[PDB]
Amino acid sequence: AGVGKTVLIMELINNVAKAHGGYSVFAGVGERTREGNDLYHEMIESGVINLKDATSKVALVYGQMNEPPGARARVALTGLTVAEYFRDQEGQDVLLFIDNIFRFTQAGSEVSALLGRIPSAVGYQPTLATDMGTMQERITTTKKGSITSVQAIYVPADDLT
Amino acid sequence: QMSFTFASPTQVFFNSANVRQVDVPTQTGAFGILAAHVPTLQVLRPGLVVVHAEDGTTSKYFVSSGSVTVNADSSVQLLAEEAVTLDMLDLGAAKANLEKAQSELLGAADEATRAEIQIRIEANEALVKAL
Amino acid sequence: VAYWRQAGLSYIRYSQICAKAVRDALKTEFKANAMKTSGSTIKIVKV
Amino acid sequence: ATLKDITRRLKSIKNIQKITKSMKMVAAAKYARAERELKPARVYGVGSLALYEKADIKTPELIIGVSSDRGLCGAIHSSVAKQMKSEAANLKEVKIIGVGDKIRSILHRTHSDQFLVTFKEVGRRPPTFGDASVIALELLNSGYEFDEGSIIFNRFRSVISYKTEEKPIFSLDTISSAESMSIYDDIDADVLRNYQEYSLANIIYYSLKESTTSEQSARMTAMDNASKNASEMIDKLTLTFNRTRQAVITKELIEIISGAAALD
Amino acid sequence: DPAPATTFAHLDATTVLSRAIAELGIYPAVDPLDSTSRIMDPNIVGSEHYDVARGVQKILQDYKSLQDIIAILGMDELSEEDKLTVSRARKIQRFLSQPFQVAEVFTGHLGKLVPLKETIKGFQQILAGEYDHLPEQAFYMVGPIEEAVAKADKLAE
Amino acid sequence: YFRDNGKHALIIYDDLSKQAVAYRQMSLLLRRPPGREAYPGDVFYLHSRLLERAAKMNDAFGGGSLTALPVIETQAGDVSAYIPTNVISITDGQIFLETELFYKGIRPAINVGLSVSRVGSAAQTRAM
């Protein structure tokens, strides 16, 4: 955390998304305003977002905590939707940062309950997999390019069970 | 040839090394064990060991005590209680010790003590040999 | 049996003093190791 | 049960894991050293036997355990213990010297009266020739000398091994009149003795140093044992743990909801 | 689990299969000190069985205590009687193990049957230490205890 | 109000642990679902939205700030409890205090590992 994880990621973007003409989408899932800020300047600073240049190579899409669940939940579909735009349209091999998808997941579960639905044991929406599956299956490699997914993934409860 | 084993608990210097002679400060005083020297068992005196090794060397040592062993077998065993190459003794100390030691002898008054001081004195002598 | 086997004296007794006297001799540099190499953590009991 | 119980468990095991390791590496350090430092000694002590080798002397009349002062970080002592009581049957005069208080410890088996002396805390800050000489010297004096017996010590053998030795212990200059004694000439119930002595010292030292080495590898080893055990054991539980943990949650969510959903 | 919990109420003899045991490859699989019959009696089972069993039950139970101990304490510094029992228990265990008489397909052996007295006797014998200065191996997958001794012999090679 | 008044405030929320309870109690009482750990799910959101309102602002906002010290009182180190866990995932670190030390008299009594300022090291006095 804060090790320049993001930085590394920027560097990756730099190495690749520059190199091969990949672009990036960042889905700030469960991000702190603070962290999105952090990124913001990091990108600004880095000039991998360039608010005067198209060397702003990243569209930042934010689906932060502070939103209603639905938004955060859906930010996943959304982020996908952009990259698909780049992918197919812009032929791209997209780097898709969805960070931290876990919180998205949480959101799914959050609503699950509040969708009157049973989520499941461990809280989890029982559809957890399908939600995912369907999401994941959008994300892929095709005859359209690739949406290559760099996903910040929290070790939930430092458990995985 | 004679296989010379030179050790102290501290160190093994030679271990059955084909040394031609070692001349020993045994309590004999010496007997300068030749490769053709009858096997013999000796208790070591404080004096100096000279390791005439079949190699154009005679190596210098002081040993305090212990036992030296001349096996029937080609091996000679210096099992030196304190084993030093003369290289590490301290001359300065010796003299200084020696006066002191004698002094203490002058004040020694058990047979044993006397023995001991004298021993010590002597020690300094046997060191003094080198030193 | 003379003065290091005195009338008595262990050869040890002697010996150790000899060696000890050697240890006493030599340089100091070495003597650090000396007692170190001639501890006597041998505490003693009869049982 | 519960995770409690488990953690209660875990807690310690983990502690253990560490502890064992503390004890381990420390032991290993000592050990490492002990071995290392053992080289000149090895020779030296091997030396000690010089002619005991080339003719042992028989005593129809000197059992002496040598162990460290602690154990149960291994059954180190138990080996000698074995070998010494076993000895004691065989023997003459059984007066015993225990270098090691883990020698005292075992010995009480008619070996509280039949100790002659005991030497103590030779580990925990090593033993030495200095010590050896000490134990040697006083040992003599006592009308106990050769009464045959053994010097039973832990002869270190390899990192992974030692084999606890037992010896013939002979110091009667008299049967070291007989035999070979002549042959490697230069002898006197002096020089004899003053080697017999010296080799008693050499051995006593040596053996001792082996002993301790053996222990140091043995505690380390004991600590090995443990940690390996520890680690799995932990491993296992922690799942089971987790499971039950989750079990909670799940169940609990049940209990709660759908246990106190619209249904309660 | 409630279900079994209930079940017990109706039971008369419980054959508790132990996964723990089983996994050791053991067939029989039973958790012995759970596999019971209430009609444990110095009368009905006669005391011979009963006691022998109680002694056995005990030792196994005791041993059981020890598992835990050795598990965590390695082994090796225990009472040697325990050491003995531990092994014995294993023999006993092993002896309790029987090859399969129908499932040579599973076993590659035939399985056996032990007329009860040879059994009571059996334990009495092991208890008697009669076998216990032996390797532990042979008792495994056996029928009558004598034969386990026989089996010992072949193994004592 | 201070934050926007370029002013730097510290609110210590003592305790939101207690809020969660109350709110759960509230939720459930509304005979309406809660969420996870039987606690309302978006209580996280709740708090997230609450807590996001604590911030370090630029100049436009007078540079003000709202510094938050939320407090959560653990029960037997059970941060694992989803809701604490929640809070953690929002926080900028958490300050773990350990009783053992306290009892030891060791005061500060902190569990150090668990005491965290996630990267709070970009506002440290060189002296320090």
Swiss-Prot record, chain C:
It comes from Bos taurus. InterPro entries: ATP_synth_F1_esu_mt, ATP_synth_F1_esu_sf_mt. This is ATP synthase F(1) complex subunit epsilon, mitochondrial. CDD domains: F1-ATPase_epsilon. The modification N6-acetyllysine is found at K20, K31, K36, K43. GO terms for cellular component: mitochondrial inner membrane; mitochondrion; proton-transporting ATP synthase complex. Belongs to the eukaryotic ATPase epsilon family. Component of the ATP synthase complex composed at least of ATP5F1A/subunit alpha, ATP5F1B/subunit beta, ATP5MC1/subunit c (homooctomer), MT-ATP6/subunit a, MT-ATP8/subunit 8, ATP5ME/subunit e, ATP5MF/subunit f, ATP5MG/subunit g, ATP5MK/subunit k, ATP5MJ/subunit j, ATP5F1C/subunit gamma, ATP5F1D/subunit delta, ATP5F1E/subunit epsilon, ATP5PF/subunit F6, ATP5PB/subunit b, ATP5PD/subunit d, ATP5PO/subunit OSCP. PANTHER family: ATP SYNTHASE EPSILON CHAIN, MITOCHONDRIAL, ATP SYNTHASE SUBUNIT EPSILON, MITOCHONDRIAL. GO terms for biological process: proton motive force-driven mitochondrial ATP synthesis. Gene3D superfamilies: ATP synthase, F1 complex, epsilon subunit superfamily, mitochondrial. It is found in: Mitochondrion; Mitochondrion inner membrane. The modification N6-succinyllysine is found at K20, K31, K36.
Curated annotation (Swiss-Prot), chain D:
GO terms for biological process: proton motive force-driven ATP synthesis; proton motive force-driven mitochondrial ATP synthesis. Coiled coil: none annotated. InterPro entries: ATP_synth_F1_ATPase_gsu (IPR035968), ATP_synth_F1_gsu (IPR000131), ATP_synth_F1_gsu_CS (IPR023632). It is found in: Mitochondrion inner membrane. The modification N6-succinyllysine is found at K24, K85, K120, K236. It is a peripheral membrane protein. The modification Phosphoserine is found at S112. One of its GO terms (molecular function) is proton-transporting ATP synthase activity, rotational mechanism. NCBIfam families: ATPsyn_F1gamma (TIGR01146). Component of the ATP synthase complex composed at least of ATP5F1A/subunit alpha, ATP5F1B/subunit beta, ATP5MC1/subunit c (homooctomer), MT-ATP6/subunit a, MT-ATP8/subunit 8, ATP5ME/subunit e, ATP5MF/subunit f, ATP5MG/subunit g, ATP5MK/subunit k, ATP5MJ/subunit j, ATP5F1C/subunit gamma, ATP5F1D/subunit delta, ATP5F1E/subunit epsilon, ATP5PF/subunit F6, ATP5PB/subunit b, ATP5PD/subunit d, ATP5PO/subunit OSCP. PANTHER family: ATP SYNTHASE GAMMA CHAIN, ATP SYNTHASE SUBUNIT GAMMA, MITOCHONDRIAL. This is ATP synthase F(1) complex subunit gamma, mitochondrial. It comes from Bos taurus. The gene is ATP5F1C.
Swiss-Prot record, chain E:
Coiled coil: none annotated. Catalytic subunit beta, of the mitochondrial membrane ATP synthase complex (F(1)F(0) ATP synthase or Complex V) that produces ATP from ADP in the presence of a proton gradient across the membrane which is generated by electron transport complexes of the respiratory chain. ATP synthase complex consist of a soluble F(1) head domain - the catalytic core - and a membrane F(1) domain - the membrane proton channel. These two domains are linked by a central stalk rotating inside the F(1) region and a stationary peripheral stalk. The modification Phosphoserine is found at S47, S65. Transmembrane segments: none annotated. Belongs to the ATPase alpha/beta chains family. Homotrimer. Component of the ATP synthase complex composed at least of ATP5F1A/subunit alpha, ATP5F1B/subunit beta, ATP5MC1/subunit c (homooctomer), MT-ATP6/subunit a, MT-ATP8/subunit 8, ATP5ME/subunit e, ATP5MF/subunit f, ATP5MG/subunit g, ATP5MK/subunit k, ATP5MJ/subunit j, ATP5F1C/subunit gamma, ATP5F1D/subunit delta, ATP5F1E/subunit epsilon, ATP5PF/subunit F6, ATP5PB/subunit b, ATP5PD/subunit d, ATP5PO/subunit OSCP. The chain holds residues 369 to 525 of 528 of the full protein. The gene is ATP5F1B. The modification N6-succinyllysine is found at K154. This is ATP synthase F(1) complex catalytic subunit beta, mitochondrial. It comes from Bos taurus. The modification N6-acetyllysine is found at K58, K112, K117, K154. It is found in: Mitochondrion inner membrane.
Curated annotation (Swiss-Prot), chain F:
Belongs to the ATPase alpha/beta chains family. Heart muscle (at protein level). Heart and liver. It comes from the Eukaryota. The chain holds residues 299 to 426 of 553 of the full protein. Subunit alpha, of the mitochondrial membrane ATP synthase complex (F(1)F(0) ATP synthase or Complex V) that produces ATP from ADP in the presence of a proton gradient across the membrane which is generated by electron transport complexes of the respiratory chain. ATP synthase complex consist of a soluble F(1) head domain - the catalytic core - and a membrane F(1) domain - the membrane proton channel. These two domains are linked by a central stalk rotating inside the F(1) region and a stationary peripheral stalk. The siderophore enterobactin (Ent) produced by enteric bacteria binds Fe(3+) and helps bacteria scavenge iron ions from the environment. As a consequence, the mammalian siderocalin LCN2 plays an important role in defense against bacterial infections by sequestering iron bound to microbial siderophores. LCN2 can also bind iron bound to endogenous or nutrient-derived iron chelators and plays an important role in cellular iron homeostasis. Mg(2+) binds at D14. It is found in: Mitochondrion inner membrane; Cell membrane. Disulfide bonds: none annotated. The modification N6-succinyllysine is found at K7. This is ATP synthase F(1) complex subunit alpha, mitochondrial.
